[PDB]
Amino acid sequence: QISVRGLAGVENVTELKKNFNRHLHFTLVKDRNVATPRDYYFALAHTVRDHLVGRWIRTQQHYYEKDPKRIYYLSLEFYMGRTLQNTMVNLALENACDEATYQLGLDMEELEEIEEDAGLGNGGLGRLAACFLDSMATLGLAAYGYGIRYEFGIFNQKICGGWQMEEADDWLRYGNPWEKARPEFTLPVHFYGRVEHTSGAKWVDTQVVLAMPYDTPVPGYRNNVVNTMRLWSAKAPYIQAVLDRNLAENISRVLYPNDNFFEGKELRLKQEYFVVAATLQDIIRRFKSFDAFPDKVAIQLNDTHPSLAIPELMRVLVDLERLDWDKAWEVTVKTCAYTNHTVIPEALERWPVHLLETLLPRHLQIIYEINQRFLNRVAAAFPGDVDRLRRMSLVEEGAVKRINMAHLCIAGSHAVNGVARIHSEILKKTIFKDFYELEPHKFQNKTNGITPRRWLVLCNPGLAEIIAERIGEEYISDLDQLRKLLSYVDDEAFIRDVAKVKQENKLKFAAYLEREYVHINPNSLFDVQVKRIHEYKRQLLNCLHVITLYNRIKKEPNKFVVPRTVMIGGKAAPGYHMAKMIIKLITAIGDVVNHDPVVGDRLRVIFLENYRVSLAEKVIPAADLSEQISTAGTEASGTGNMKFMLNGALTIGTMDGANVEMAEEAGEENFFIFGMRVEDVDRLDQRGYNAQEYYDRIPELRQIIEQLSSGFFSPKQPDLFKDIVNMLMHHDRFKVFADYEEYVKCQERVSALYKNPREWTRMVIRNIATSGKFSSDRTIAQYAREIWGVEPSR
Amino acid sequence: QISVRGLAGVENVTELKKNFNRHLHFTLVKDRNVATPRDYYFALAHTVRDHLVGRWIRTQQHYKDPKRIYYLSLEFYMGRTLQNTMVNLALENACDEATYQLGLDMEELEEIEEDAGLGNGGLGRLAACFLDSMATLGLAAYGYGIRYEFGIFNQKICGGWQMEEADDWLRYGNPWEKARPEFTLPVHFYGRVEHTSQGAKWVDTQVVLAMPYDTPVPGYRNNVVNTMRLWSAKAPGYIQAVLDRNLAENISRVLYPNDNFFEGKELRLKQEYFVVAATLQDIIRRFKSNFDAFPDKVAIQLNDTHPSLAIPELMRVLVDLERLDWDKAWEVTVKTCAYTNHTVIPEALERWPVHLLETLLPRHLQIIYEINQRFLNRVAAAFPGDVDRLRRMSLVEEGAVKRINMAHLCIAGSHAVNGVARIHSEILKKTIFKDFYELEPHKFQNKTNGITPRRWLVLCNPGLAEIIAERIGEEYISDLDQLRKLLSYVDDEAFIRDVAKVKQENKLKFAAYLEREYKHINPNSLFDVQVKRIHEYKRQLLNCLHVITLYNRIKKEPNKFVVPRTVMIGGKAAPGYHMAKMIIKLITAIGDVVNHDPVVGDRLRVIFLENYRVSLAEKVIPAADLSEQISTAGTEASGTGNMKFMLNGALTIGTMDGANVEMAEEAGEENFFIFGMRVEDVDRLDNAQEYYDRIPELRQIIEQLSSGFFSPKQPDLFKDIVNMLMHHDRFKVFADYEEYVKCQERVSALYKNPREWTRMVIRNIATSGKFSSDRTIAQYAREIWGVEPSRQRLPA
Numbered sequence A: 001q002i003s004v005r006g007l008a009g010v011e012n013v014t015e016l017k018k019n020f021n022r023h024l025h026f027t028l029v030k031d032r033n034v035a036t037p038r039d040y041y042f043a044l045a046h047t048v049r050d051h052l053v054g055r056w057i058r059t060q061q062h063y064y065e066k067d068p069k070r071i072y073y074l075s076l077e078f079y080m081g082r083t084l085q086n087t088m089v090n091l092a093l094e095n096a097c098d099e100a101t102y103q104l105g106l107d108m109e110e111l112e113e114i115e116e117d118a119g120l121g122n123g124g125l126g127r128l129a130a131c132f133l134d135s136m137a138t139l140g141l142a143a144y145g146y147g148i149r150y151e152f153g154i155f156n157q158k159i160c161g162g163w164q165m166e167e168a169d170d171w172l173r174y175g176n177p178w179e180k181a182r183p184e185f186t187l188p189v190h191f192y193g194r195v196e197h198t199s200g201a202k203w204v205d206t207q208v209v210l211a212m213p214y215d216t217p218v219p220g221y222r223n224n225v226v227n228t229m230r231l232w233s234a235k236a237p238y239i240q241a242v243l244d245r246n247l248a249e250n251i252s253r254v255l256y257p258n259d260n261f262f263e264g265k266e267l268r269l270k271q272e273y274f275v276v277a278a279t280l281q282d283i284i285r286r287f288k289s290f291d292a293f294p295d296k297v298a299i300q301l302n303d304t305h306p307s308l309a310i311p312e313l314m315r316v317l318v319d320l321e322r323l324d325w326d327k328a329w330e331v332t333v334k335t336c337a338y339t340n341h342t343v344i345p346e347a348l349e350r351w352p353v354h355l356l357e358t359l360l361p362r363h364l365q366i367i368y369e370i371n372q373r374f375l376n377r378v379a380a381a382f383p384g385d386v387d388r389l390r391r392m393s394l395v396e397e398g399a400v401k402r403i404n405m406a407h408l409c410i411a412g413s414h415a416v417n418g419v420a421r422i423h424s425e426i427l428k429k430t431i432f433k434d435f436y437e438l439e440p441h442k443f444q445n446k447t448n449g450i451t452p453r454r455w456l457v458l459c460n461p462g463l464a465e466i467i468a469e470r471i472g473e474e475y476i477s478d479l480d481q482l483r484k485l486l487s488y489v490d491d492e493a494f495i496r497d498v499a500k501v502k503q504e505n506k507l508k509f510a511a512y513l514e515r516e517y518v519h520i521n522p523n524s525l526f527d528v529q530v531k532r533i534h535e536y537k538r539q540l541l542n543c544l545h546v547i548t549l550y551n552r553i554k555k556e557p558n559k560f561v562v563p564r565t566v567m568i569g570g571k572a573a574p575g576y577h578m579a580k581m582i583i584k585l586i587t588a589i590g591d592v593v594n595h596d597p598v599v600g601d602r603l604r605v606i607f608l609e610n611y612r613v614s615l616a617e618k619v620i621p622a623a624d625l626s627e628q629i630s631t632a633g634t635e636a637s638g639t640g641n642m643k644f645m646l647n648g649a650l651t652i653g654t655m656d657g658a659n660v661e662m663a664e665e666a667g668e669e670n671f672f673i674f675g676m677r678v679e680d681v682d683r684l685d686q687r688g689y690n691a692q693e694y695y696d697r698i699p700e701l702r703q704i705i706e707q708l709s710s711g712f713f714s715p716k717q718p719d720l721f722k723d724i725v726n727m728l729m730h731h732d733r734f735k736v737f738a739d740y741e742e743y744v745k746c747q748e749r750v751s752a753l754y755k756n757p758r759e760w761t762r763m764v765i766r767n768i769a770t771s772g773k774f775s776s777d778r779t780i781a782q783y784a785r786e787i788w789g790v791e792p793s794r
Numbered sequence B: 001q002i003s004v005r006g007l008a009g010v011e012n013v014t015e016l017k018k019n020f021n022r023h024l025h026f027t028l029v030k031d032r033n034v035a036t037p038r039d040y041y042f043a044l045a046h047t048v049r050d051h052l053v054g055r056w057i058r059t060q061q062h063y064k065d066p067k068r069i070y071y072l073s074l075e076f077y078m079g080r081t082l083q084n085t086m087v088n089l090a091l092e093n094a095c096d097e098a099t100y101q102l103g104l105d106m107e108e109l110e111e112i113e114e115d116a117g118l119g120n121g122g123l124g125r126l127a128a129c130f131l132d133s134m135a136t137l138g139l140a141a142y143g144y145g146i147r148y149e150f151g152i153f154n155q156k157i158c159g160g161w162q163m164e165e166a167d168d169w170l171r172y173g174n175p176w177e178k179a180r181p182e183f184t185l186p187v188h189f190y191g192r193v194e195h196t197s198q199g200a201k202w203v204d205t206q207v208v209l210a211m212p213y214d215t216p217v218p219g220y221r222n223n224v225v226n227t228m229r230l231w232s233a234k235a236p237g238y239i240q241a242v243l244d245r246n247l248a249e250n251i252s253r254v255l256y257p258n259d260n261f262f263e264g265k266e267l268r269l270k271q272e273y274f275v276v277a278a279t280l281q282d283i284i285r286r287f288k289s290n291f292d293a294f295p296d297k298v299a300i301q302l303n304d305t306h307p308s309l310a311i312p313e314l315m316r317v318l319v320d321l322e323r324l325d326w327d328k329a330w331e332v333t334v335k336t337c338a339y340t341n342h343t344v345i346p347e348a349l350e351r352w353p354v355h356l357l358e359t360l361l362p363r364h365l366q367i368i369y370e371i372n373q374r375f376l377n378r379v380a381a382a383f384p385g386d387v388d389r390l391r392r393m394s395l396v397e398e399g400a401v402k403r404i405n406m407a408h409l410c411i412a413g414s415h416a417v418n419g420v421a422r423i424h425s426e427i428l429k430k431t432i433f434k435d436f437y438e439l440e441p442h443k444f445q446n447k448t449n450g451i452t453p454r455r456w457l458v459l460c461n462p463g464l465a466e467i468i469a470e471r472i473g474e475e476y477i478s479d480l481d482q483l484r485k486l487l488s489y490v491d492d493e494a495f496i497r498d499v500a501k502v503k504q505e506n507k508l509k510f511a512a513y514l515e516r517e518y519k520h521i522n523p524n525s526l527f528d529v530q531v532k533r534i535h536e537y538k539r540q541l542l543n544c545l546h547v548i549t550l551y552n553r554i555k556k557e558p559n560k561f562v563v564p565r566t567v568m569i570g571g572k573a574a575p576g577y578h579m580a581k582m583i584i585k586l587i588t589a590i591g592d593v594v595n596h597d598p599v600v601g602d603r604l605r606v607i608f609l610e611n612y613r614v615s616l617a618e619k620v621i622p623a624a625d626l627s628e629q630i631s632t633a634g635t636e637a638s639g640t641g642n643m644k645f646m647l648n649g650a651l652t653i654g655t656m657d658g659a660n661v662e663m664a665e666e667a668g669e670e671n672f673f674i675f676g677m678r679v680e681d682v683d684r685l686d687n688a689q690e691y692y693d694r695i696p697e698l699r700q701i702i703e704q705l706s707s708g709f710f711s712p713k714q715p716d717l718f719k720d721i722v723n724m725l726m727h728h729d730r731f732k733v734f735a736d737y738e739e740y741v742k743c744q745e746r747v748s749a750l751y752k753n754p755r756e757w758t759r760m761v762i763r764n765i766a767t768s769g770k771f772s773s774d775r776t777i778a779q780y781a782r783e784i785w786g787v788e789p790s791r792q793r794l795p796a
């Protein structure tokens, strides 16, 4: 039907159909009168994966021959989501498969709903790695993503009685047709033991866990390129001994549900080394099949989680390859680069020295050696600056001596980058200021991006098409060509069509909620905040605005208000008490608002259950207003924001992370910017933040806190939200009250624009047209030329 | 090359090569450039697997609405699946040609496949032969069991000692299983019994999911493909909660390596209820797709007492869930269930402590006591005033620990009870189940064990199969009684030559196997083979006494000629069993002296065959000259290894125990090396000292064992063997020693007469027909299940 999804030729369609029935017969062992809806998905899944094989083999054989420099994106997280539709898109098979399945009497989009999400990530950091994998393939880069095959991904969230309930994400339950086990490359990973020193060093008496690789294809956009994601699963090398094999194998069991937080879990450390040791061993093998090592190898560290790659490569070159220290260290630093994702201090990985001593004795030794030579450098550039040394040291002082993994990374990386312009500048000026003064050349910016395949062509084919009608399809892998749409801001047809595709998407998401769960008003402003639940994200600020909306209606029931459906989605860390309370608050607001006869259709507040990649694909194309309301200086970049912008939502936001650059690309008159700037946060910090001042001064704010505290939103348990109130009044690091007045005033302005369909749509066009910079193709190109030292090719 | 393996039709060969390359490419993602032998096995496995699916779908659709037979077993000792599949679909020759043209040795590919070693020994191997026979006899038969992640331990010999390694048989994936997610079921554990307005309900339980995997069971050239359904366990701070999922999933992780023993392990009971609860749920769903007709549509065969919980579980579903009255439900249950016993050894009997059942299965314990009361009321009615009889028949045993006897349970709830060999089925009626036979004589039957002539002849001994078919055709494969036509060829010069030719060929193949995988044996020696699980009752120790006697006799008379022997002993010991582990090390310790004495050289060799399993049996058994089957009379219920040796052309030295009796009967006692005490004779003792003093040769050997002749660095190592043989031998080894050695002299005397050795072998092979599992299954079908076997073909 839709030209962007390619051709459905007669002979090509008949092939798909024969191979569909073939797979149902031989692969799934079924007839047409016994086959389950899952069986049909799998037959199509296999039908599509057959088309990947040839190119995959050829792609990797092409790299062997050209022998380009190899990019290894090292990450504990790959938030991949579904694979079927994405594969069909990248290979231009979508229409021909849709027709094939229709002819056979099946709804392909219903079949697509059976695939489990590869939810191997927590949030932004993890989905960035997934977007990167897409872009690196589309740009022809010799790139491999290296990670862990968690048996269980991010927990599946159930909302029970208004509360978050965690259940296991058993994604591999029915099989993974999109992975290929490669047991020929099973490798030993070592733990514990001790270190002998001889006339070199020798790591002896270790416990072994095998690492078994599973390869998953990464198709580039219509370029016949198929790269690889390699994920390692833990494998053990009378009766109790056999069951005790579980302990070693628990290393790859489950993804740690920690978004932006650190705890020194020993199992976490084992995971990070597991991935590091196996990957690096695999990298060296491929290299041999070391002066030229950094000419042929780039290792990108996605946060400090794989920071162990620094001493581990030092361990291999020195202890096993018998290289001199200084030479191994030149090679190591030229190889590794580090991407920082957050300035929040509780997220910073600082491992107890004791824990590293027992588990990785040799690595501890090397860390201490790296630290001495590095501080000898700091002492030489800044002689007598004693306090600089203790600040820049990898070893932290205390009743628990710790290793600062970030400091390890900066010392062992030739490139250190932030994720948005403002965040990268924050690193030079504050958190890494000492490091910036020592080696300013190391410090870069690489503003995040999102893939316009999954986040436009895949999730919003209707928008992709109306754009295609005007400028062709070249934009899909050259997103800057969206600026051509500026010439259409006064086009009556395009204005009609943009509005039309939005309503259509809003209708589809409304059907999804009805079918799977709730009735939402299709004729209301879709107000959406989806992301992880954190204080810094300030879902709680959204909450105060929603209650403001509610109280304003109660104060003047007859007064028209632009009807809104307020949607908030996101998972809370299972151990995050405040985040769990925040989810409970949102549902409890909904309990009162959604049932008050006076309100009715004017205001609905719903918590979107189990926010994940496949849900993002559904809800973001249906959003009108994108909530991006972090307190300035807290959100390093954001990527959810870029998705909303590309899918036709207007943004209400602070001047934080990539919101700054989004406002710059679209012009600040097409953006609903509000609140404190970073400077204003410092002004409050230096003077001391008193939220009681705001309380005593703002009557509407006063009303809500008394509602919260007295029990208006928890009648059966009036005590319920006391921790939220006490925090907001006396321990708010995130100054929710300081931005309340500007937020509510700025939301009034949003409602004013919505009352005017035409000027809402024209502002929408101005956003879509200038989202081009926020393609991950742009991001990867900068990484490649500025850090990796390779040239992309489409 | 050979006729018995079918046609290598040019068109099949072309399509076989095409699908091989296709699978290598699409399924395996490989080129001939980076493909290993393992890739090549899997490419073939998939190619052959494809030929099963059409038949498999059409078979299960065909199931006419016949009565369905459900063989329930904790063990299915299947072995490998590639060759067996090709034989039954008549594709062996076509695939040998296909891989040849592709530059590959098909037999080298077959060696990659791991055994499905989901069994300990005979019991589990029996289930496997039974599935094959039931498919070949066209019965709507399902095998139900557990998918152990780790089968029977892989055995390595280190320092002459048994090492145990985990049988990670699933490591590279199993092409021969098909997961069936739509049929995942909840199995419940622990919880409590509460009482509602309408009956009892089992609530507040812990749930473990049961995930079914189906394996195709092809019939020999009849287009029938049945199913073995094997259940895998699946779970329904946060991190620890996810990790703790391992606990439920541990239920299906490992096969208990107990063979002749009962361990009251709680994890074992969980395994038993796991398979039973899921199976019965499955059975009832297919029945629904009135319970008076349940027995005419369902037969549940209980392989030993391991699945005995099926009795209270069927009662539970019928009463608590389906709401039938107790009496009617009980009628359905007894008419549906039948019990097979496999041993009389007291330590093997399952006797679960009442305390354990109460906690894990509180509702089943209630139902057990209710069954017991109604059963004992019955006993009291038939034999009024026999109080002792009541305590002896009760499902509940008194003592410091109250226990439920599962065998008493099975008989009470079964309409048929059978032993596995004529002699054993009789001793059941006369001793261990004497009282139950007196109450219900109609229930007690015999079903002599069998082995499949496909796997145990056409597959493992194709050369033998071929020379046989050259005389009588291929009809014998699924009609083994036709082997009696070979009796006519007993004076035939060509057949005598051919039988000898194929045996020497098999001996050369095994001698190459040993040199390749583990290195030397002399191919021109008598192959004296004892392979089976290691245990006192089996008497590997009697073999050791003969071996040492043979060694001492050559050292006393060095110039005297002796018929050269290669004595091979193979088998696994139970990892707890200290005495069985000592036996294995004693066998290697002997070997260590005898194999390095320059005066002996190639004249006598003693070797321990490492890692005996189904795939190894298929190698050594075709090569054996002498089958050792030397169990103390009364202890081996039937045996099955004995039958394999007979069909493959080995002579048998054995006691009149188990199926040895019927083997000798079929062939004629002239054609068998019978020795030692019969059952009657054993019942006249249970003093080994009497033998030691009267027999000077026996004396010398026991002086060598204790004084440290076979263990120099460890002088007292075998003190426990000496002490047990002298004082605590339950299996009177010393009592049969004398007859054993003399009978072994008559083995050697015949061997030095090659024509007469071979003629007797002919008489053995030709009368092995009865010991086909097709004969066993026909009987089960007719005499227990009430179904008619058919060798009728299905279309296409």
Ligand SMILES: O=C(CN1C(=O)[C@@H](NC(=O)c2cc3cc(Cl)sc3[nH]2)Cc2ccccc21)NCCO
Residues within 6 Å of the ligand: A049, A050, A052, A053, A056, A177, A178, A179, A180, A181, A182, A183, A217, B026, B027, B028, B029, B042, B171, B172, B173, B174, B175
């Ligand atoms: O080497 C194998 C052989 N093998 C496959 O490669 C396996 N193939 C794939 O999983 C696979 C194939 C393709 C093509 C892709 Cl494109 S992604 C992908 N994955 C099929 C299979 C089935 C049963 C047993 C083994 C296999 N397996 C190791 C598994 O632990």
Ligand SMILES: O=C(CN1C(=O)[C@@H](NC(=O)c2cc3cc(Cl)sc3[nH]2)Cc2ccccc21)NCCO
Residues within 6 Å of the ligand: A026, A027, A028, A029, A042, A174, A175, A176, A177, A179, B027, B049, B050, B052, B053, B056, B173, B175, B176, B177, B178, B179, B216
């Ligand atoms: O390559 C595959 C394809 N595959 C099957 O083999 C496929 N079917 C079988 O395992 C299978 C097929 C047949 C035919 C038989 Cl006859 S026995 C048997 N088993 C089911 C499946 C489901 C989900 C993902 C992949 C598969 N799997 C390797 C495991 O990742």
Ligand SMILES: *Cc1c(COP(=O)(O)O)cnc(C)c1O
Residues within 6 Å of the ligand: A122, A123, A124, A127, A530, A531, A532, A611, A612, A613, A616, A637, A638, A639, A640, A641
């Ligand atoms: C993009 C994405 C995130 C990150 O969104 P932010 O608003 O930038 O925090 C988190 N979760 C999912 C499922 C995503 O797709």
Ligand SMILES: *Cc1c(COP(=O)(O)O)cnc(C)c1O
Residues within 6 Å of the ligand: B120, B121, B122, B125, B531, B532, B533, B612, B613, B614, B617, B638, B639, B640, B641, B642
């Ligand atoms: C048949 C067989 C057995 C049973 O042999 P017996 O001598 O009757 O105990 C045990 N293990 C394997 C592998 C077999 O094939």
